[PDB]
Amino acid sequence: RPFTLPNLPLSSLSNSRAPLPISSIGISPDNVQSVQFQNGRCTLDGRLVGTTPVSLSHVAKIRGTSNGTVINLTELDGTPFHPFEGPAPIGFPDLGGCDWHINMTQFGHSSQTQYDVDTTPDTFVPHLGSIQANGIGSGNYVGVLSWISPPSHPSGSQVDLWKIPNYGSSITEATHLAPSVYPPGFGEVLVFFMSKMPGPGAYNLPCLLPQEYISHLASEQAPTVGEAALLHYVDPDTGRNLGEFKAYPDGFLTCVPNGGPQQLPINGVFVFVSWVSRFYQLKPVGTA
Amino acid sequence: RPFTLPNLPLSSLSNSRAPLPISSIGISPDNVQSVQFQNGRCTLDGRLVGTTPVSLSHVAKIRGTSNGTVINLTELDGTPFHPFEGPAPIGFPDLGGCDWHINMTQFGHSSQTQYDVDTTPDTFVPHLGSIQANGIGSGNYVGVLSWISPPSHPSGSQVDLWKIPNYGSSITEATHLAPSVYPPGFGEVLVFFMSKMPGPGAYNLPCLLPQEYISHLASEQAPTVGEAALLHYVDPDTGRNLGEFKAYPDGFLTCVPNGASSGPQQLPINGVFVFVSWVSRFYQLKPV
Ligand SMILES: C[C@@H]1O[C@@H](O[C@H]2[C@H](O[C@H]3[C@H](O)[C@@H](O)[C@@H](O)O[C@@H]3CO)O[C@H](CO)[C@H](O)[C@@H]2O)[C@@H](O)[C@H](O)[C@@H]1O
Ligand SMILES: C[C@@H]1O[C@@H](O[C@H]2[C@H](O[C@H]3[C@H](O)[C@@H](O)[C@@H](O)O[C@@H]3CO)O[C@H](CO)[C@H](O)[C@@H]2O)[C@@H](O)[C@H](O)[C@@H]1O
Ligand code: NA
Ligand code: NA
Question: I want to staple A148 with a disulfide (CB 3.0 to 4.6 A). Which of A98, A226, B10, B29 is the partner?
Answer without folding.
Answer: A98
